[PDB]
Amino acid sequence: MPHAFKPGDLVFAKMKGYPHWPARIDDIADGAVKPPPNKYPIFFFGTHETAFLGPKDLFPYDKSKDKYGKPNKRKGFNEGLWEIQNNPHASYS
């Protein structure tokens, strides 16, 4: 059965106005800004942007890839698909 989300989990993450987007739950570095309560730091592959989201917007990647893992014209998306499939735990700083 499912656990709660933890750092390193792979997802598609949903933001208003954007397609479900390949992403990971990030760690929070020592000294770095923490998310608001009940929110996770989401790193978006391809764009390399961070936003804070709750579970309602997080779709586990394995379950969801058949639906959401297709090319999209949006900037950074297809780069993001490569990253989540081929090196999802790398440093992209």
If you count them, how many residues does the chain have? 93
Q: What is the C-alpha end-to-end distance of the chain, expressed in Å?
A: 33
Contact by Cβ (8 Å): 75, 47? yes
Residue type at 17 in one-letter notation: G
Q: In whole angstroms, give the CA distance from residue 48 to residue 69.
A: 17
Resolution reading in Å? 1.4
For the chain, how are helix, strand and coil distributed in percent, rounded to 5? Answer: 25, 25, 55
Write down the experimental method used for this entry: X-ray
Nearest to 60 by CA among 1, 12, 8: 12
Dist. CA 45–CA 61, nearest whole Å: 13
> Cα(10)–Cα(40) distance, rounded to whole angstroms?
12
Cα-trace Rg, the chain? 13
